[PDB]
Amino acid sequence: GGFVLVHAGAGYHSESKAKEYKHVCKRACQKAIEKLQAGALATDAVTAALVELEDSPFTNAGMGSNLNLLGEIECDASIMDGKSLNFGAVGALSGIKNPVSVANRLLCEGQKGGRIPPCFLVGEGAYRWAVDHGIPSCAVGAVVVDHEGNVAAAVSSGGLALKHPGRVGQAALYGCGCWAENTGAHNPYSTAVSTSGCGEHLVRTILARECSHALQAEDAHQALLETMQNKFISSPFLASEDGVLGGVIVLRSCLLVEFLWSHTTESMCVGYMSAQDGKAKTHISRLPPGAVAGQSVAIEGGVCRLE
Amino acid sequence: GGFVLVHAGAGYHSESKAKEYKHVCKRACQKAIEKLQAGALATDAVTAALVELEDSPFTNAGMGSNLNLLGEIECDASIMDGKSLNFGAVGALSGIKNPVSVANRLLCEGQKGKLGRIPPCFLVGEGAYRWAVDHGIPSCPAVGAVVVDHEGNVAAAVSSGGLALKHPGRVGQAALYGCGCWAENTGAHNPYSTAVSTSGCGEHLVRTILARECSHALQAEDAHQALLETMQNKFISSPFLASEDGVLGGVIVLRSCLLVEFLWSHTTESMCVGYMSAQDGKAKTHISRLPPGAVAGQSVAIEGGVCRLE
Secondary structure (H helix, E strand, C coil): CEEEEEEEEEECCCCCCHHHHHHHHHHHHHHHHHHHHCCCCHHHHHHHHHHHHHHCCCCCCCCCCCCCCCCCCCEEEEEEECCCCCEEEEEEECCECCHHHHHHHHHHHHHHCCCCCCCEEEHHHHHHHHHHCCCCECCEEEEEEECCCCEEEEEEECCCCCCCCCECCHHHCCCCCEEEECCECCECCEEEEEEEECHHHHHHCCHHHHHHHHCCCCCHHHHHHHHHHHHHHCCHHHCCCCCCCEEEEEEEECCEEEEEEEECCCEEEEEEEECCCCCCEEEEEECCCCCCCCCCCEEEEEEEECC | CEEEEEEEEEECCCHHHHHHHHHHHHHHHHHHHHHHHCCCCHHHHHHHHHHHHHHCCCCCCCCCCCCCCCCCCCEEEEEEECCCCCEEEEEEECCECCHHHHHHHHHHHHHCCCCCCCCCCEEEHHHHHHHHHHCCCCECCCEEEEEEECCCCEEEEEEECCCCCCCCCECCHHHCCCCCEEEECCCCCCCCEEEEEEEECHHHHHHCCHHHHHHHHCCCCCHHHHHHHHHHHHHHCCHHHCCCCCCCEEEEEEEECCEEEEEEEECCCEEEEEEEECCCCCCEEEEEECCCCCCCCCCCEEEEEEEECC
């Protein structure tokens, strides 16, 4: 009972590291499905996927993250639960092995509930909070749907290479890095979204939420393509860019699960797996023949039936 | 030509402090008008207003911001430009007198473009501090504003010290894109130039990405209905805040098509606002309060007017 879709990042293609990206995606899916079969929450299953993705020294998230301008690792990560709509996030976080675990814990403590617990912490404060909650001290994304139709999403990143210290990207921002929202009065489908690419491009277009909105339309493939074209590549908010670089993985369910991935970057490695079927599928998505990176859109999808 | 609208201290009503809020809103508006009259950029004028608002010891922003759990000050601020649609923001920033000045500088630098890497739009903590100092921004030894210039260009900014006794590093809506403020000039799919600035419970404003939601709603002919529908449906009754016992927030908005419609709305007991036209002179300050019999966090208050520019 369950389905997962993950990505190891959207960016330059690597005919040498592609094998590494596909393997971690395979392992990440395995982790997520195993959690679901253990009867774990969708948030816990998406978190497990991200931990595996972060741990790969080949991914720009967690260990192996791009060093910033000071030669330090500063991580961004967030997670959202479709059932409760709660969210957890950390930005510019250093000294913590798995940034996504901190985000997940923040979301969980959020459930507990006068004063509303913090949903977004940065820097030292985020580090202090993590240690205070027993989280081990020392880009990638996933969307999941459990056997009950609940959806969750998460994203983790090391941010731009040599970025100025304190520079925060889309992986830490609400509505930008990921989105998870179960079916509701004005939300026909339970949708989950996770993004990757130039943080600035994804933030200014609030891409994750935008994709989720678009996905409430009848045709998911047309809906996502129009979003990537009009609300991203041709977005007036990115008129200041010479090429828009980003990728997304999406899941929509009602269990009938439709999943897609789309990117404007040269490539994007994805992986997916269905619980009642096993066997993780991986794929390096690349832009069509003679296409233009930052100017065109690659898009693919599939469907999963959860009995 | 030009118009400005600012706000300070959206929350509980305190007559003893009302006068103080009014005074700072008045000078913030004057600083903004002075800029515009001197042919300044809409973003510089809104920044000028925020500097004044932050400098008041009575506002939870800049000097006078609430202290966090460790007794330290950590500020959040952002500004957006309707012309270029560019944005600048800082979060959990300490050691800087006027957080909004850092966000405005980030925006200005970013507008310069890559021509040698994609400019940052959001910096936090120590890094934010270092960037500020490296860019000549005065260091140490919510409030908001929306503006429209004579050309119809709009801008908005917001600044806050966040929740009192908050955990170190907790960043609120004043630093988050689409939540604290929004500014967007008329376009092909946006018949109006709109500017929005928010205030209230950080959590509530973020979960609803209120500032942006307001700007999008305001693309409907009726501004008054657009704002009211948003505060009720997209805020108080939003499914994203269903578990909350009361939703607390306030917003100031400006929409131009030179015709300038300006409004403020809030679910808090009160909110102090100030507005001024570049041609009318004399700042107008007002303490907006919820109607009698209305419950804070459960109801909405809304007021405003129209201004003509030439």
